[PDB]
Amino acid sequence: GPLGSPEFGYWITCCPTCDVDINTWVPFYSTELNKPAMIYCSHGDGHWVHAQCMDLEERTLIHLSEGSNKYYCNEHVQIARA
């Protein structure tokens, strides 16, 4: 019984150039069924954002999902010039 997308969910804007949208999205991860494995950042304002949206690997997401791991989004992994 997969939950459709009637109400809100992870269909948001992980970034300013996000493309994740059920209108044309699908379960890419092998551990997922029909939803983007969003990730939480730990830099000042922790937020939620898709993983593939930042050119990430499915394995790294699994490893980072082990529990204890300083996970960092893409816009806060190497802040310096922009």
Are 37 and 59 in contact by the 8 Å Cβ rule? The answer is: no
Fill in the per-residue mask, 56 to 75: x = in contact with Zn ion (CB under 5 A), - = not in contact. -----------------x--
Tell whether residue 35 is a contact of Zn ion (CB under 5 A). no
Beta strands in the chain (DSSP E): 39-40, 48-49
Fill in the DSSP letter of residue 45: S
- Does 47 show up as a binding residue in the annotation? yes
Are 14 and 44 in contact by the 8 Å Cβ rule? The answer is: no
Instruction: For the CB of residue 7, give the shortest distance to Zn ion in the complex, in Å.
Output: 19
19 vs 31 by CB, closer to Zn ion: 19
Tell whether residue 18 is a contact of Zn ion (CB under 5 A). yes
Count Cβ neighbours within 10 Å for each residue of 23-33 and write b for 16 or more, e otherwise.
eebeeeeeeee
Instruction: For the CB of residue 14, give the shortest distance to Zn ion in the complex, in Å.
Output: 3
- Applying CB under 5 A, the residues found at the interface with Zn ion are 14, 18, 20, 41, 50, 53, 73, 76
